[PDB]
Symmetry: C2
Subunit: 376 residues, 2 copies
């Protein structure tokens, strides 16, 4: 049933996300990074349906899925509920481009678009620069021109067989906006000896908070308009605790454990605005996550992708992610002027996100994307 399908998906995204997170963070020490394992699952599921033998089991194994039947049902169900998402602008695009002279299997192309919502199309790689321009134009179109230059013409060859591109963009609208006039330059500790002044938004907000000794950090959860999506922030107690937290976040359950500690309250939040853009070489990351055959000539066995079942493998896989976080939100400052209530003063703790922190977008109990911000 749908309950079980949603569960399988949740579990799969959980372990895949943890795995992908460590890989990316490991290859980008001391740098801002944002990634999404969720946006990658569909194309990988579509690829598992097109493979046979070893490569196919590998993909399924890494996806933590039993078979093709269940794989189709999971993503179908997803695409039976995938429109916009309230309070946030979340765009995720996936597409597989294959050489011009390779006959596409008409059926697999149909299932591709409706089941996995990820398309397949021919492009002439022989004209590399033109092909890159073509691939980059489609992405610009899928992201309101928010994302550009996903694939560099150089990275393409005249002999390229196929390329998988993945793009994800995000900007959200806070359930309760921050007042732009209140934003000011405040200290941010990049390292135990380096401090910079970055624009920091200030506001009193109802959040979900929790002290987490296990992760030696503080967890905060802020919600966006509509109350369907939320931004999770984990702030290590120490200035250099960010790496220690990353190691802990490997276990796909550390996050679940921390969330069990969450409780509702009010705090004065000091949160830096930030925009992170990351280009991830999925070929490098996935290979380190034990998905290699798919990228090995004469080993991929994508015998269901082409009509002639000609041998084909993936030459390059690229994910480009751009995240934007600012004051935008509902209910302007002067909404209800004078709220006449008790003359008293409750204590409102001050939560200052002024050290390298981890963040993650949560939608329908699934992490849409995650990352670390070490330099706003």
């Amino acid at each position: 049933g749908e309950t079980d399908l949603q569960k399988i998906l949740r579990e799969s995204n959980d372990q895949f996300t943890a795995q992908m997170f460590s890989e990316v963070v490991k290859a980008n020490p001391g740098q801002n990074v944002v990634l999404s394992a969720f946006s990658v699952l569909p194309p990988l599921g579509q690829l598992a349906l097109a493979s046979v033998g070893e490569s196919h089991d590998e993909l399924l194994r890494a996806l933590a899925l039993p078979n093709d039947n269940v794989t189709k049902d999971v993503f179908a169900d997803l695409n039976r509920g995938v429109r916009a998402v309230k309070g946030v602008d979340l765009k995720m695009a996936s597409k597989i481009y294959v050489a011009k002279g390779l006959e596409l299997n008409d059926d697999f192309a149909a299932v591709s678009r409706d089941v996995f919502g990820s398309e397949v199309q021919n492009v002439d790689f022989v004209k590399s620069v033109e092909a890159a321009g073509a691939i980059n134009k489609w992405v610009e179109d899928q992201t309101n021109n928010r994302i550009k230059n996903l694939v560099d013409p150089d990275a393409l060859d005249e002999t390229t067989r196929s390329v998988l591109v993945n793009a994800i963009y995000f900007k959200g609208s806070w359930k309760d906006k921050f007042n732009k006039e209140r934003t000011m330059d405040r200290d941010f500790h990049v390292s135990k000896d380096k401090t910079i002044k970055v624009p920091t938004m200030i506001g009193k907000k109802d959040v979900r908070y929790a002290d987490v000794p296990e992760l030696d950090a503080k967890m905060i959860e802020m919600s966006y308009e509509g109350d369907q999506a939320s931004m999770i922030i984990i702030l290590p107690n120490q200035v250099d605790g960010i790496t220690a937290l990353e190691q802990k976040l490997k276990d796909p359950k550390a996050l679940s454990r921390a969330e069990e500690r969450l409780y509702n309250t009010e705090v004065e939040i000091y949160l830096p605005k930030f925009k992170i853009e990351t280009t991830t070489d999925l070929k490098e990351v996935l290979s380190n996550m034990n998905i290699k055959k798919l990228f090995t000539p004469g080993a991929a066995r994508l015998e269901n992708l082409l009509k002639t079942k000609e041998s084909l493998y993936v030459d390059a896989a690229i994910q480009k992610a751009f995240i934007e976080v600012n004051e935008e939100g509902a209910e302007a400052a002067a909404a209800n002027a004078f709220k006449i209530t008790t003359y008293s003063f409750h204590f409102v703790p001050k939560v200052e996100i002024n050290k390298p922190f981890f963040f993650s977008l949560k939608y329908n109990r699934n992490s849409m994307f995650s990352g670390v911000c070490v330099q706003p």
Copy 2:
């Protein structure tokens, strides 16, 4: 810290609620029932602070609390955040009345009001009927006259030493209202052979849903205005499955397990309107939950309640709960007329709550009250 205090409270309310639920349901077979273990905890905590020896350990044991120090901190923290609660009208009143000729300990009375928010006061029980009228007037005042006749003059004696009264009232405002014009008489299966027609509200709503094989039921979670409180409904698959579910609900974790299955979706809900009013003899229930000394002359040892430390025990303890569930909600039908979107039609499953079901109000991850409705 507050994180740990909230946790202890959650755990305590969880096991106490389960325990109290079975007791009440057991003594009221085939009847509507609503109860609240949460509203009872504070007065029991205040009573644990006033006791010594065995009676004191008993109370603490049942409260699943370590000591007086932690007990005070838990409820203090609670009363450091207890005002109204968004989208719902939730009133909970507690008070201890003691005979007129018993000198109250001035200090314990102070701590009573601020820490536990439960008052203590003298009343002349010698004039039973007048005392009952006095106790019933205060309750009416605490509940906007919503609740009356909590204590019957008969139940009081001229020799009564003390009485604990507990009252809880509730009415909520749905995040998305039901259309009154849409409400109609529909079938409700009271038993496998009896069917009646009760007013049933109909509406398409975004909810949290899950099929729960363990409990052989369907779980639904609807939210109220503000998104802080939610109504949990567990509908057994079978018409007579209600009793089987009650047995399962004894384990304070069955509910937690079921909630892990919840996922967001849209359904067409058919929910009967209903109002349940229950008068529970807390003396009978609590005694069955191993809290006896507190009600035994020469065994209570409430040596901190009176200035002269005179011997005193509780003669009667009464909880009266009144729950109201109807169409009231935010955003009237004609809010945004014509919402111009795709011409298509998604499938929206039909969820018909037409058999004896369990319900529970969840606020800040704590069940404010729970019960069963077998006859709307």
